[PDB]
Scaffold this active site. Structure first.
Site, PDB file in Angstrom:
ATOM      1  N   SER A  51       2.746 -14.662  11.341  1.00 39.46           N
ATOM      2  CA  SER A  51       1.522 -14.641  10.988  1.00 39.46           C
ATOM      3  C   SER A  51       0.429 -13.574  11.804  1.00 39.46           C
ATOM      4  CB  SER A  51       1.193 -16.782  11.688  1.00 39.46           C
ATOM      5  OG  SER A  51      -0.154 -16.633  12.441  1.00 39.46           O
TER       6      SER A  51
ATOM      7  N   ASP B 247      16.227 -31.226   8.387  1.00 42.80           N
ATOM      8  CA  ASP B 247      15.283 -31.157   9.295  1.00 42.80           C
ATOM      9  C   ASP B 247      15.854 -30.933  10.958  1.00 42.80           C
ATOM     10  OD1 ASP B 247      13.698 -31.435  12.090  1.00 42.80           O
ATOM     11  OD2 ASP B 247      14.488 -33.757  11.898  1.00 42.80           O
TER      12      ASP B 247
ATOM     13  N   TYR C  11       0.929 -22.411  19.641  1.00 38.75           N
ATOM     14  CA  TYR C  11       1.035 -22.136  18.268  1.00 38.75           C
ATOM     15  C   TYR C  11       0.955 -20.587  18.278  1.00 38.75           C
ATOM     16  CZ  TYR C  11       0.131 -20.256  13.379  1.00 38.75           C
ATOM     17  OH  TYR C  11       0.463 -19.543  11.946  1.00 38.75           O
TER      18      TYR C  11
HETATM   19  N1  LIG Z   1      -1.604 -21.128   6.395  1.00 39.28           N
HETATM   20  C1  LIG Z   1      -2.197 -20.579   6.816  1.00 39.28           C
HETATM   21  O1  LIG Z   1      -3.140 -20.633   6.884  1.00 39.28           O
HETATM   22  C2  LIG Z   1      -0.722 -19.534   7.962  1.00 39.28           C
HETATM   23  C3  LIG Z   1      -1.875 -18.415   8.381  1.00 39.28           C
HETATM   24  C4  LIG Z   1       0.420 -17.655   8.802  1.00 39.28           C
HETATM   25  C5  LIG Z   1       1.173 -18.599   8.908  1.00 39.28           C
HETATM   26  N2  LIG Z   1       1.935 -19.480   8.408  1.00 39.28           N
HETATM   27  C6  LIG Z   1       3.583 -20.139   8.077  1.00 39.28           C
HETATM   28  O2  LIG Z   1       2.996 -20.524   7.105  1.00 39.28           O
HETATM   29  C7  LIG Z   1       5.238 -21.647   7.069  1.00 39.28           C
HETATM   30  C8  LIG Z   1       4.167 -22.479   5.886  1.00 39.28           C
HETATM   31  O3  LIG Z   1       3.159 -22.817   6.171  1.00 39.28           O
HETATM   32  P1  LIG Z   1       1.942 -22.811   5.313  1.00 39.28           P
HETATM   33  O4  LIG Z   1       2.945 -22.548   4.014  1.00 39.28           O
HETATM   34  O5  LIG Z   1       1.278 -22.217   5.612  1.00 39.28           O
HETATM   35  O6  LIG Z   1       2.088 -24.371   5.651  1.00 39.28           O
HETATM   36  P2  LIG Z   1       2.388 -26.236   5.949  1.00 39.28           P
HETATM   37  O7  LIG Z   1       2.131 -26.457   4.254  1.00 39.28           O
HETATM   38  O8  LIG Z   1       2.213 -26.501   7.489  1.00 39.28           O
HETATM   39  O9  LIG Z   1       3.949 -25.732   5.410  1.00 39.28           O
HETATM   40  C9  LIG Z   1       5.001 -25.728   6.672  1.00 39.28           C
HETATM   41  C10 LIG Z   1       5.848 -26.861   5.833  1.00 39.28           C
HETATM   42  O10 LIG Z   1       7.158 -26.530   7.297  1.00 39.28           O
HETATM   43  C11 LIG Z   1       7.163 -28.446   7.590  1.00 39.28           C
HETATM   44  N3  LIG Z   1       8.117 -28.571   8.647  1.00 39.28           N
HETATM   45  C12 LIG Z   1       7.198 -29.189   9.730  1.00 39.28           C
HETATM   46  N4  LIG Z   1       8.642 -29.813  10.615  1.00 39.28           N
HETATM   47  C13 LIG Z   1       9.599 -29.396   9.938  1.00 39.28           C
HETATM   48  C14 LIG Z   1      10.704 -29.662  10.261  1.00 39.28           C
HETATM   49  N5  LIG Z   1      10.987 -29.596  11.571  1.00 39.28           N
HETATM   50  N6  LIG Z   1      11.629 -29.586   9.364  1.00 39.28           N
HETATM   51  C15 LIG Z   1      11.854 -28.298   8.623  1.00 39.28           C
HETATM   52  N7  LIG Z   1      10.819 -28.397   8.150  1.00 39.28           N
HETATM   53  C16 LIG Z   1       9.504 -29.042   8.744  1.00 39.28           C
HETATM   54  C17 LIG Z   1       5.672 -28.753   6.502  1.00 39.28           C
HETATM   55  O11 LIG Z   1       6.876 -30.156   6.635  1.00 39.28           O
HETATM   56  P3  LIG Z   1       6.991 -31.840   7.263  1.00 39.28           P
HETATM   57  O12 LIG Z   1       5.137 -30.922   7.413  1.00 39.28           O
HETATM   58  O13 LIG Z   1       6.732 -33.185   5.919  1.00 39.28           O
HETATM   59  O14 LIG Z   1       6.986 -31.978   8.306  1.00 39.28           O
HETATM   60  C18 LIG Z   1       5.739 -27.870   6.083  1.00 39.28           C
HETATM   61  O15 LIG Z   1       6.822 -28.477   4.093  1.00 39.28           O
HETATM   62  C19 LIG Z   1       4.524 -21.708   8.387  1.00 39.28           C
HETATM   63  O16 LIG Z   1       5.765 -21.591   9.078  1.00 39.28           O
HETATM   64  C20 LIG Z   1       3.326 -21.697   9.031  1.00 39.28           C
HETATM   65  O17 LIG Z   1       3.654 -21.012  10.254  1.00 39.28           O
HETATM   66  C21 LIG Z   1       0.376 -20.263   7.252  1.00 39.28           C
END
Ligand SMILES: NC(=O)c1ccc[n+]([C@@H]2O[C@H](COP(=O)([O-])OP(=O)(O)OC[C@H]3O[C@@H](n4cnc5c(N)ncnc54)[C@H](OP(=O)(O)O)[C@@H]3O)[C@@H](O)[C@H]2O)c1
Ligand SMILES: NC(=O)c1ccc[n+]([C@@H]2O[C@H](COP(=O)([O-])OP(=O)(O)OC[C@H]3O[C@@H](n4cnc5c(N)ncnc54)[C@H](OP(=O)(O)O)[C@@H]3O)[C@@H](O)[C@H]2O)c1
Lengths: 276, 276
Positions: free
Chosen positions: B142, B65, B155
């Protein structure tokens, strides 16, 4: 009626100079609430206020610690006029050193004061501005929020955060009549043993180099706070203020290089050579 | 020996897809520590791991975490190889809504996870990379850390903070042999009553408009996470990686407009029209 201004971080530097510049304005147009984290630090502000002959009642001090929403709300209630025409979010902290040498608490503090504290101010004061359809928000910005500086990683993180915060708000606030602007400043005239214990000898040496370079830039380019404070006044009086005002043009070239190579390679190489 | 990778936030989305893409690589070059805030969420990761036939021992899960330095340090100790070749800071939180409607705790959490949590990872893992003269750090970035988005103020503040953090570090890390890169993603396929109680009716209406616009952009432009995950691999294999990799070119034009008018006026007007 007078333009009511509330400014955060007025114990020294820009906030102190802006508070007395406004309170002492020859037109007596402004009523200034100069706020400070700790009222025991208000002596320089009052010494400066007297030196510029601020009329009695033009300047008032309130305790306001931007880390606490209760302090933010109690200072808001002390604004006897029931409105703030101009809010100046200036309170800030620096943080310098090798990233691995910075305390976890020191890191969290910089972000809480610099970023969450401005969010706290905007939450407390923006809604009344939006309902009225008027109000000006000025935020003290930095060249460090526009380009990354070695050994200022967390400070830069925090100033870059304010750029993102303010630009996002500005996009929404456009048709509300509420104007937000960043005042982008360069340098302004306002133990080795412990760092060495927390980092490697090479990073420590690079830190020295950064510091020697920083001292030379400051010696050559630091602006007087009167000159910087006047850019706030310029933004305040613009009928259609822009999102950003620059206190100097000195870093624009670097800024343009940075902005013109989105891979970041040109900037990283140029700034590495500039500092080291 | 295998390339040891440790990735944060692997329960879903990009981190989950990257973990299994690496663990299932046909060359079996990578050993992946897929870390998650809560191990009760690891089921999709293991379902995906099986679907790509990750060999036994190619993928391991750890609880990590990023809000707690004790959790960061205990996961570091669980890396049996005693080294991390590739650290991927991907854990992140979104936060959407009118600034005045966001809880103080929700704001502080976004900054603590997104910004202080990456600082915590870098403090824990950078020193060993610097001593060795090698290591790659990838940070999920992002488009929101490059330009402000309405109703994404906090954000955006947090993603802009990572840009400042990483660029500042990159300037120092240039001659150490340790490479840091941001992977800049656009949209990726991964109660009204309460918001209305906390804001004015006009802001609430603008919020609807933003959301309708967001849904259309996502429907039209969201990329598959496999495509996004591969940009991480591209950065990993570059002999001289750049500070930034873009997963798409779709926002570059907006980026260039933003970067070409440092007053911020062109961007604020163009983005207001794009969304509203
Ligand atoms: N998806 C988009 O449209 C988009 C666009 C640009 C950039 N991004 C970036 O991509 C990354 C991943 O997101 P996804 O892959 O897109 O979205 P996501 O499913 O939101 O991925 C985020 C991950 O971060 C974890 N997380 C949250 N709090 C945490 C903590 N305290 N310690 C460790 N892990 C934690 C979440 O798990 P839990 O929910 O279990 O905490 C989830 O596994 C993020 O940094 C996001 O800003 C996403
Ligand atoms: N000086 C430069 O070279 C430079 C360059 C670019 C931008 N800026 C910005 O200018 C602003 C003012 O700095 P100066 O005017 O340059 O420097 P300064 O003297 O550091 O001003 C910062 C003010 O912020 C106050 N402050 C710190 N924590 C606070 C808190 N929790 N609540 C309320 N106030 C708090 C400080 O008071 P205490 O110390 O009593 O807390 C001080 O009065 C900062 O935001 C800074 O980043 C400065």
């Amino acid at each position: 009626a007078r333009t009511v201004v509330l400014i955060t971080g007025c114990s020294s530097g820009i906030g102190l100079h802006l508070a007395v510049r406004l309170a002492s304005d020859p037109s007596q147009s402004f009523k200034v609430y100069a706020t400070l984290r700790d009222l025991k630090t208000q002596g320089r502000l009052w010494e400066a206020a007297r030196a510029l002959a601020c009329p009695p009642g033009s300047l008032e001090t309130l305790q306001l610690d931007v880390r606490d929403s209760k302090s933010v709300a109690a200072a808001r209630e002390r604004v006897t006029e029931g409105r703030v025409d101009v809010l100046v979010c200036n309170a800030g902290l620096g943080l310098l050193g090798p990233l691995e040498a910075l305390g976890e608490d020191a890191v969290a503090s910089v972000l809480d004061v610099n970023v969450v504290g401005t969010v706290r101010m905007l939450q407390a004061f923006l809604p009344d501005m939006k309902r009225r359809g008027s109000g000006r928000v000025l935020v003290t910005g930095s060249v460090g929020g526009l380009m990354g500086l070695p050994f200022n990683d967390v400070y830069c993180a925090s100033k870059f955060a304010l750029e993102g915060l303010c630009e996002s708000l500005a996009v929404l606030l456009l048709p509300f009549g509420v104007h937000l602007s960043l005042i982008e400043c360069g340098p302004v005239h306002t133990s080795p043993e412990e760092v060495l214990d927390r980092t490697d000898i090479h990073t420590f040496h690079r830190f020295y180099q950064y510091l020697a370079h920083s001292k030379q830039v400051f010696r050559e380019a630091a602006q007087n706070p009167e000159e910087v404070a006047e850019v706030f006044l310029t933004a305040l009086r613009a009928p259609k203020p822009t999102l950003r005002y620059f206190t100097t043009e000195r870093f624009l070239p670097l800024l343009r290089m940075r902005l013109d190579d989105p891979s970041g390679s040109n900037y990283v190489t140029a700034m590495h050579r500039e500092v080291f």
